[PDB]
Amino acid sequence: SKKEVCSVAFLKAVFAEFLATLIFVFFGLGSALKWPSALPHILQIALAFGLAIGTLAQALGPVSGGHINPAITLALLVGNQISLLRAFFYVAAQLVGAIAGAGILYGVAPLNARGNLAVNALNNNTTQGQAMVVELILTFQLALCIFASTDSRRTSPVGSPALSIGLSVTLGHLVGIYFTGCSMNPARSFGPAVVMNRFSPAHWVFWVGPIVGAVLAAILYFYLLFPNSLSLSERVAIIKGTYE
Amino acid sequence: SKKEVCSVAFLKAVFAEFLATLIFVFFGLGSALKWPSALPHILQIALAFGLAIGTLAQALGPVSGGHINPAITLALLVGNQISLLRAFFYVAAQLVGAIAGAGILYGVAPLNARGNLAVNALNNNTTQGQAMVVELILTFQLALCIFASTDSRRTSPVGSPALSIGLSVTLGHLVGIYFTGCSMNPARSFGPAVVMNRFSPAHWVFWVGPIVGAVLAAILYFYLLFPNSLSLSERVAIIKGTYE
Amino acid sequence: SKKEVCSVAFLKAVFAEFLATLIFVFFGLGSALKWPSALPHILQIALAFGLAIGTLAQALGPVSGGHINPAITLALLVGNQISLLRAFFYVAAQLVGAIAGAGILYGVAPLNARGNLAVNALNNNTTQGQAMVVELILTFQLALCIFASTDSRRTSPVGSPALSIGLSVTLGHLVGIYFTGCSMNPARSFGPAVVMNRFSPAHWVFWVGPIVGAVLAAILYFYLLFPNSLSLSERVAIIKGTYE
Amino acid sequence: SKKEVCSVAFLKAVFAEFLATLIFVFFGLGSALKWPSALPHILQIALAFGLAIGTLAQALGPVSGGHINPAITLALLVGNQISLLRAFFYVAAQLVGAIAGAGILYGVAPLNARGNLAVNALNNNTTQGQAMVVELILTFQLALCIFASTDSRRTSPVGSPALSIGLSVTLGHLVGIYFTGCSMNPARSFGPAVVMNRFSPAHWVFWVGPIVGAVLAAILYFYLLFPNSLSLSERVAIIKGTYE
Numbered sequence A, B, C, D: 001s002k003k004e005v006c007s008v009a010f011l012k013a014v015f016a017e018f019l020a021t022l023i024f025v026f027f028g029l030g031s032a033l034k035w036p037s038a039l040p041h042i043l044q045i046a047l048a049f050g051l052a053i054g055t056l057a058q059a060l061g062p063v064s065g066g067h068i069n070p071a072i073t074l075a076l077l078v079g080n081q082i083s084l085l086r087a088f089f090y091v092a093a094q095l096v097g098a099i100a101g102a103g104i105l106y107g108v109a110p111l112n113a114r115g116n117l118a119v120n121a122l123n124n125n126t127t128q129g130q131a132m133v134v135e136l137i138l139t140f141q142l143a144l145c146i147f148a149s150t151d152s153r154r155t156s157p158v159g160s161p162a163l164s165i166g167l168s169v170t171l172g173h174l175v176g177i178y179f180t181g182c183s184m185n186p187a188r189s190f191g192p193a194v195v196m197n198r199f200s201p202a203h204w205v206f207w208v209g210p211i212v213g214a215v216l217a218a219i220l221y222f223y224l225l226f227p228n229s230l231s232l233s234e235r236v237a238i239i240k241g242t243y244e
């Protein structure tokens, strides 16, 4: 719907998705660099990734929904929450933002700590198929947490949606870092991979794992656990971007 | 009650308790595996067990109550909050879930990190009886925090029920790892024990300790501190699953 | 007031303070013991002292107020919030709870980990006067947090009072552990000193500092920053325990 | 507006800014001192700086706004939220408070921990230009978090504004400590520099960085993302402290 697409609100929602992924990728990779004076602990990395998401969802969430992740965007598309063009523009803004975020870190990081710019890397003792099942589970819990925390029909105390979602990213890293350095986000993986021109043969896992994981969470959440009562034409209106 | 059991909503609750226990033990055991490149810190593990519950309570709490622990479900039955059949199906789903969680983790962990699959284990310098009193206290504070945070009659600012409950699991880990590897949940102990075919002689401590501790918190909470004005006919109807 | 002190609600409040200080001291000390398998990091101890208070304030706070500290009790008394008899019984229940918690820990901790049972020891390079001004600042920030977070006239979003209060205890340990092992609570120091029967020549700092620190926060909060429109008779009615 | 300044409410607000900055700087620098018994880990320092802000915004926020940072005060001025004289008196009190807080720490810290009193220090492999871009980004995300969390127009669950803001400070520290020891606040840097009469050649970075970074966040938030429908005349009444 070009009337939804050519709006001021839509322009600033696409911009917020660009800026949030820029910041997220900046803080995340910068925390996991191989700083020689003190090599970062898994705890430090899990916390920086989680607190960045938690802060950006709190600050830019009222502007665009604060997806900051192509897997979550595509899951919301599948789960009939956003339009087709919102998904296209958000994903492209997230990928552009991740590249810019990694590029800014590349420019300010000193040579002795920059290394491979914290690109995701599959553990030598784990296979692509093994790692793919892990990324699916890391992203599934994250998406499920997001959908329950942002659902307007929830009546029980929601607490802090932003911090709940943020600490779900921290949780994902406390296991995921051992398998693939933890991605949960195709853009977070693509970002440094473009700046360093370093795409491993396992790069596909970092896209498929999170997308399948979030899509399975959206199917379970929006269609099996808490479905809404919308007519066939109301569901296509949401895809087209002309709903209410 | 055949009306309570043969309900689509009860089937969703049983599946959610299965799914959340599956995801819980996956992350919990996954975080405490003896990873060669970096041996998990105590703070790291305590935070992973705590945030896994914190996330699952936020996500699947609306579906089933977010029990995820046979000891909490038994305390809720003895505290007259749930039916006998709900308690029965819940414990079953949690046990099967814990097994399924440990097995998925088994299929993905690399050989050099698998080890015991994070089974609970008494400290060599502590006795079975000493472990039991520790497990009772660890699970007593967790159940108290749950009962207080989910009480519909609470007029005090509750904050985040999921994060308080989750950080109460982190608290019990900061003390209980040194004694038994921290259980506070019979399903967390049974899960890896079944998958690895490894049961310690102190395995009973991992069932009795948390169950006694949670039941003592239910009697103190629901019968001594904050009782309801309920008649014999209403109390019996809660057990039979026929109440309102 | 015989009408207030002989009541069932008052009996439950005193018990809650004993039980909360029992659990707080058991968790607090048990996290700081010199465990041979892995000596607890400062961040492990700050988080365990902080999460125990946060969890206990959430669980038992609606029963008694979740004082769990003699210094906070006396600050609420001077600030004209609680009665003189309420303060005496709270302080006595807190002192006995701290002794009981320490004793339960003593009989459960193994011989090689038990040691001095996490008693407050002053740093060999800081004078008693330096440690007292530090304990003044430590408890002052905590008390101000408790007052602002539990004021019923507060219109600003309070978030989670329990977690804010508990994370304040964590902050206090990140500075205070270095100076005195961190007290901010006379009963926390009293507890293990009575079980181990070992009182330092600076134990008075652990009473003077916290009390004076909480007291100055009560004078500043309740009389300078946000005073109430209460007549002199209403003030004595509060101390006597006859007010509303 | 001399009547805005000559008000008991303004007297309490300026005192709160002073006291909050005194406490923030004492706790922050104290957590980063080179304590020989155990040298502080990055995770300890980041948490202490963050939890001091979270705690102080929770307690003194209702009194003055809980700015505690000259870059945030100046950013709110540009964003048309505070008067010119409120900005003047807040900044003045923050610098005075930072010096007092650093000076109090000097008076209580043992000689083996004192060192440089945890002043900011440029990493030798980072240029003043690189570290300036870092300080910009660190403070930019913190300001956006504050503006989105304190906006009275927010319809989405804010959760805990204080904890969200505080954990954004921890987040900034998880990256910035490697570049500059993390400033994000001109008063934080000014305090121990004045007390130790030690001003490195890159002290300007710890002013320009945070100020520009927070000012860009204030321009983006109040003028581009969420502008108010006010008239130029009402806008100058805000600058002059006469509006509502």
Ligand code: NI
Residues within 6 Å of the ligand: A041, B041, C041, D041
């Ligand atoms: Ni460490």
